[PDB]
Design a protein around this ligand. Structure first.
Ligand SMILES: N=C(N)c1ccc(CNC(=O)[C@@H]2CCCN2C(=O)CCC2CCCCC2)cc1
Ligand code: NA
Ligand code: NA
Lengths: 11, 27, 249
C-alpha cells in the first residue's frame, strides 16, 4: 500500500 | 573481510545504545 | 517487530528489504553477506500452501534503508535479482526445516555508511555464542503487534534452551532451528512478527567485536505471546550449503 513510488528505472 | 564492522559504529569506535545488553549476557 | 524500538541510523547496515515490483510492497527482510549476495528465509520466496512461488523478475532488494515506506534518495540502493537459490531439503510441507535461501544480485552494490555486510559464523564463534541466555538482536519492518512501523525496528532477545523451545509447541523442532525470547515470568518481552521474515538474528562477538548473523527470522505462533518463542533458521548448521552455492555460482 502506503509505499512511496520507486524510480520507474528499477522496474 | 571487513564484514560485521559498521561504518557508523565500530569503525568510529562508537557504541550503539543497546549493544552492551548483548555483551552483558555473554556470561 | 513487537516491543522493540526505532533503529539508530546505520545500526544494521546489512539489513535488506525484499520488495515486490507489482504491486509495490514490502515482502520480507533479508541480509547482505557480501557485495553480490543476500540471505533470506526460503518461505519468503516459496510457500505452496499460500500459493507463493516468486521468481527473480518479481522482486527487488532495497539496501541501506531506514524508513519502511519512503524512497530514501541518495541513501538506499535498489537491486535486481540474477538468481534465487533455495535449500533443496527446505521442508515447507511440515515444519519449515532448512528455511534458507540465497539471492545473487545482477550487479554488486556499493558499500557506504548505510550499506555493509554482516559476517557469517565459523564453528567456533557459533559454539561460543549460541548458548541459552545469550542475547542476539533482530531487526525488521514487520508488524508492531499481532500497525506497521515508520522506520526499521530493533529488539534484543535471549536464546532459549532447547527443551523449553520444544515444550512450547506442537511443531517438530530440528537441529536446524533455534528459538529466542523472554519467558513469561522474566518480565521483559519482544518478538519478531509477520513482515520480519527472512531478516537477521545477529550477535556481537566479544572476541573480535564483529557482528555475526546466527539466525534467520523463520516462524512463530502469534507474535510476542506468553509462553511462545520466535523460531530462527540456524545459519551455522546450513553454512555448508551456503558455501557450496556461492563457491559454485
Ligand atoms: N517470531 C515470530 N513470532 C514470527 C516470525 C516470523 C513469522 C512469519 N513466518 C510465518 O508466518 C511462517 C510461514 C509459514 C507459516 N508460518 C508460521 O510461522 C506459522 C507456523 C509455521 C507453520 C509451518 C511449519 C512451521 C511453523 C511469524 C511469526
Ligand atoms: Na512440544
Ligand atoms: Na513469548
Amino acid at each position: 500500500g502506503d509505499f512511496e513510488e520507486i524510480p520507474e528505472e528499477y522496474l | 573481510a571487513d564484514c560485521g564492522l559498521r561504518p557508523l559504529f565500530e569503525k568510529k569506535s562508537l557504541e550503539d545504545k543497546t549493544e552492551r545488553e548483548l555483551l552483558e549476557s555473554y556470561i | 517487530i513487537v516491543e522493540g524500538s526505532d533503529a539508530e541510523i546505520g545500526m544494521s547496515p546489512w539489513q535488506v528489504m525484499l520488495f515486490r515490483k507489482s504491486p509495490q510492497e514490502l515482502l520480507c527482510g533479508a541480509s547482505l553477506i557480501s557485495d553480490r549476495w543476500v540471505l533470506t528465509a526460503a518461505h519468503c520466496l516459496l510457500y505452496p500452501p499460500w500459493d507463493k512461488n516468486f521468481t527473480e523478475n518479481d522482486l527487488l532488494v532495497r539496501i541501506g534503508k531506514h524508513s519502511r515506506t519512503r524512497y530514501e534518495r541518495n541513501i538506499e540502493k535498489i537491486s535486481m535479482l540474477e538468481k534465487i537459490y533455495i535449500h533443496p531439503r527446505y521442508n515447507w510441507r511440515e515444519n519449515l526445516d532448512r528455511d534458507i535461501a540465497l539471492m545473487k544480485l545482477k550487479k554488486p552494490v556499493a558499500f557506504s555508511d548505510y550499506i555493509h555486510p554482516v559476517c557469517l559464523p565459523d564453528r567456533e564463534t557459533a559454539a561460543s555464542l549460541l548458548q541459552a541466555g545469550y542475547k542476539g538482536r533482530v531487526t525488521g519492518w514487520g508488524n508492531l503487534k499481532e500497525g506497521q512501523p515508520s522506520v526499521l525496528q530493533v529488539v534484543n532477545l535471549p536464546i532459549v534452551e532447547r527443551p523449553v523451545c520444544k515444550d512450547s509447541t506442537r511443531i517438530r523442532i530440528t537441529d536446524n532451528m533455534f528459538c529466542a525470547g523472554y519467558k513469561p515470568d522474566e518480565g521483559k518481552r519482544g518478538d519478531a512478527c509477520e513482515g520480519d521474515s527472512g531478516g537477521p538474528f545477529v550477535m556481537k562477538s566479544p572476541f573480535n567485536n564483529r557482528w555475526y548473523q546466527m539466525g534467520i527470522v523463520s516462524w512463530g505462533e502469534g507474535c510476542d505471546r506468553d509462553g511462545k518463542y520466535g523460531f530462527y533458521t540456524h545459519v551455522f548448521r546450513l553454512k555448508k550449503w551456503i558455501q557450496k552455492v556461492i563457491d559454485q555460482f
